[PDB]
Symmetry: D3
Subunit: 261 residues, 6 copies
């Protein structure tokens, strides 16, 4: 039967588990489309990880240029404003190294050039685990978000190939095989992390981005963010959870039953 084969493939051939995927790890990259996405999607989990003495590094794809409705606030000023804010925010969470790709907000390319930037940082830092948005989240209308999710996944895979971006090799950045990928802002989580006793810090980590979260905007966003973490919290029977989708690496390619975990 298929069922026995599926069970055996997962337990005996792949050895993939969902009890804690995040355990073997002392270095991880958290990849974000915009300054503030790491905090919003997985702030809780970044602290929880900070404390185990996990080196948590960010890559931020874009500069946040466009994130204002203020006509006398230029894009260049805002980028500088949001750089501060993410440093303020990252300290609150225990992150101590941010890479800035500096692609303009709303103009993140979907290209080999961007994959190379991520490949270079991966091959350099050799993290055990990479986090990134789930690019298959229903109704996600931000291309910066979609593109981030796809390039993170492809870059993880390609970092392992020496014919991919072969100049890194020629200068002694060697192929690197990441251990796991964990996708946040996801509709299909299979691993939830409890953040009931870290919720308050996260909400604090998030309001540091003052440019994005004013008094008035925060009217809507506090409940929206309270609802979301409940949406996840309720899957494992706590108040506040953060959801991740973790799969076997094989399941990201030609796997007709990927949705069965």
């Amino acid at each position: 039967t298929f069922e026995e084969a599926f069970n055996k493939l997962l337990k005996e051939v792949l050895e993939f588990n969902l009890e804690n995927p995040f355990e073997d790890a002392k270095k991880v990259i958290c990849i974000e489309p915009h300054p503030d996405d790491c905090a919003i999607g997985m702030g809780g989990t970044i602290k929880k990880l900070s404390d185990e003495g996990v080196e948590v590094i960010y890559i931020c794809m874009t500069d946040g240029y466009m994130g204002t409705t203020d006509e006398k606030l230029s894009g260049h000023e805002l980028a500088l404003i949001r750089r501060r804010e993410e440093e303020e925010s990252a300290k609150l969470l225990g992150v101590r190294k941010i890479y800035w790709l500096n692609y303009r907000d709303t103009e993140l390319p979907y290209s080999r050039e961007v994959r190379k930037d991520l490949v270079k940082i991966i091959r350099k830092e050799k993290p055990d685990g990479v986090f990134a948005p789930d690019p298959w989240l229903p109704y996600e209308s931000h291309p910066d978000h979609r593109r981030t999710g796809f390039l993170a996944i492809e870059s993880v895979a390609f970092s392992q190939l020496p014919n991919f971006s072969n100049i890194d090799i020629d200068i002694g950045l060697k192929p690197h095989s990441v251990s796991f990928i964990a996708l946040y802002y996801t509709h299909k989580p299979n691993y939830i992390v409890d953040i009931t006793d870290l919720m308050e810090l996260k909400l604090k980590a998030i309001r540091a981005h003052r440019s994005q979260f004013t008094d008035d905007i925060w009217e809507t966003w506090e409940p929206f963010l309270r609802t979301v973490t409940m949406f996840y919290g309720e899957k494992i029977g706590v108040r506040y959870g953060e959801g991740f989708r973790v799969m076997p690496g094989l399941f990201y390619h030609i796997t007709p039953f990927a949705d069965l975990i």
Copy 2:
């Protein structure tokens, strides 16, 4: 509050004040965004008549020139494009539309790019519509890239229309930001609002048929049944013979919302 279901209910009713009962009721000006000449007529022809008849000003933006839409080996794309503009003029006349913006990107060649966003943003800023209609880019098995990109780009351009740093030369020359009230996505597998068009079906078909280059009698043998089947698909969801479906969601739902599928 206690549970997710309560939170979710509180977020819709109170925080955003989200209602599906009557989302187009307040509109005064709408833009209907179409990949090719005929998509407004096919996708939402009855609703556009209803809107016009209520005195809503309905404006089209047509993304492409329909250059490819022929199997006639002696109808060149240019001649077809001219034929199809005259067909949309007549089609839009029947539905009471008086203004059409032609972007003129070649059929099958619609880019997915900042440049096309700026086109839509320009027109949105200038017209200041309360509502914008466009295809649903997540329609399953949709295989026309002009269709998917129209969906995506119309949704992106609505959001970007509000940001003064986005296409900043608009602002410098007098086109201020604009905040649209609603987006409604047609050609959708997931509607949450249905318009009864039973009384306007025959008019819809005549406005579609105005696209003569596209609908020969022979093709109409498959297409009338196809069109009736689709509107019955929609109609049946609110218990009427013929309907037109729309997906309308709060703005927040188009972004980082993992329970977006719960309306």
Copy 3:
């Protein structure tokens, strides 16, 4: 027309049965020539190898289009992509001989760099119009969680290319030089999570795993320890659907269902 049907279900059924003349009985029964489009060397074999053999045996002329050269598929730092592309061409010439395939078009886009553009559509179109195949097989570009841009793109470009092959204004220089418009009879999509037609391959399973292993550069002994169970498992996912040990699954739809059809998922 279609005015005397009373319900959506009645209308859907009549549209399928009478207007579109669609069934999933034996979709491939009348195939004289088919093209199997694959992203990378080895894709047709893994995705639909059993079925290609079964078609070959019935005297169906089966032709590959291979989208990429496979340049990137090695962790061996001392193996260059050029050499690998040369190796993989020989592995496919040998896979294809096993399965009965006599012709391959190599588009040669570099592995991981397959563009999504009109220029690629034009290649696929030139060939489709040359060969005039009855059927075209390609990966399903909606496979959930499919993370390879080359796969997603081959799928979308296959479907689009099939459609645009019939348009004289698409790539009009093909027409000016004696390559007329062509109307393919069916598309079938492999590597699909929504198959609606399963081919029994229980018998030919061993010949299939051997057309696959022939891609030695991709399948060393230590990798086959994972890939053999994955492959058998995928094949019992499909066969189970029709209660056989081993199947290959395909999604087939009427051409109309690939455009503006909100009930396309009801087949």
Copy 4:
């Protein structure tokens, strides 16, 4: 050594460089450019019954200042203008790339279109604009010139646009390239006789040459063809730059012929 290479190792005829040509392709950016740049010479070659085929890169869509006239209608107009203009010159085949006026890409895709028409028609000569004309401000012109030269070279390479080879169209070696609209011609054609007819074939492009526009352009065109005439002591000329293939590449003394 310059001479023991030109008229010895390569055999470079500047006396009558066309003459052996049975079939030639004229590549224009826009409808009308063939007639403007080399209409006199086109007629010459037709009268000698050499087969002259046009490839028009673009649709001429943007060529009007009339706010009432769509670019689609203009393209249809200019297509029939060109069919007429060509009828007057002995041209009985025009290939239409249908890239939009102002939007001609500079890419592999476009080289492929040209390479496909080259490999199918197996021309002896290709005519095209000189992409190095000083102060040429039209990107469609510059890019036509460069893509023409590059496609001619690439048509000879089987690994270039290889599907062409898979479906029957073989590699092809053009004999000569002739660049018109050139500041540096090394071959001039007396067209003093054909001049009233050149101006006729050009004027058939009614959309482009209103009586009022023609007030400026008749003098402009006459001045241009004199500029060429003067160089071989005739009244009306059309200039071409022809060089041996090799000079199109790493040749520091290219400007010496």
Copy 5:
């Protein structure tokens, strides 16, 4: 031919080389980076402002890349450089600046960038546009060559209602500029004498502090004086700024364009 040429220029085109900027009321100066207008034609900008010509800038890029300071992020440089251009503009009597905001080193060469320039030209209706000569020999900065070409292209395409047609549908109508003047040119045919404005120009350039430190100025002051002397000497003055102006015609299919 010599007869034809003369007649064309003098009767048909009625082409002035005596004083081509005489009729100007509004001109746009198109610069690749903040400081190019001041560097390439800053004395002419002041001469024009003083005579009541409205001089408007279009700046193509943000100057994001113009620092060797590892701790100065490109965004901060851009903010700093807008402040600097506004200080520099004040001194030259320029009141309006359009910022395209394409990143320094990344200016596209595309229809999209043409549409920005066309929109501005349609809106502003200038009698003149100034831009770098895209054919300056040995020019190595892609942002400079492309401003050149794109300004020249945009000026011509601003007149075609099918080019960027949404402009016209929204009532930015087509517009025909009277002249183009190319600065940073090896081939000038009009020199303005700026001898008595030289000092003010050097001041307007130094307002771009981020770009002209003291050490840097040791090289650039002599460079700039050498360049104004190259031009000045052509009309027997100490310091000139050169421009190439041709008839619109000569920008296209004109094999004898190099005889002016």
Copy 6:
């Protein structure tokens, strides 16, 4: 400053001699490490084979950057591009050994498909920052009538990437991973029509013709009765300028002259 010069000629002389300290007697004199950038395999050897050997001999470390893979350089219908590129990699490894070159960076863009983009500048700038060379050699992109885009682009991109290698906001991830900005001392352009410095290669000519000839795929004998005559003529075009038999010509300029300098052609 520069207020007491009286004419442009006086100003230009002083600017060259005193402010820029531009010397054309011995431009390469202080070289410890140079990079030679070539569009295709064989371009360094053809362009400057003699000079690279004169440099090697002196203990100058010469590093090659090859922009493309030479995929397209064949008329042989049964020789694929992949195999050609594998062949040319070894033709260049030999050719280089002959000239004393001990490192080659292969960017591996496909021949005829070298992009003119920020991405390629990033590759150059990566290698320049890593190697920290005193000098860079590249084809002169302004060669009149040069009709190969790969060649034009390589020269423009070389000149740009040398300027941009200095700027820490250009390709800022390099800086973040320990690759700092670098300032090359000189640029020398080969394949040039306007050289201002000629190297005598008369006693190295034979060795050059041989290192060129290691590119067997490119130079048959049919080809060579036409390409030895061509090369001997080119090296005499340069040699005759300094009255030796065979020379290699270069264009050298102060970095200032690569930007907004209307008197660039005066040197």
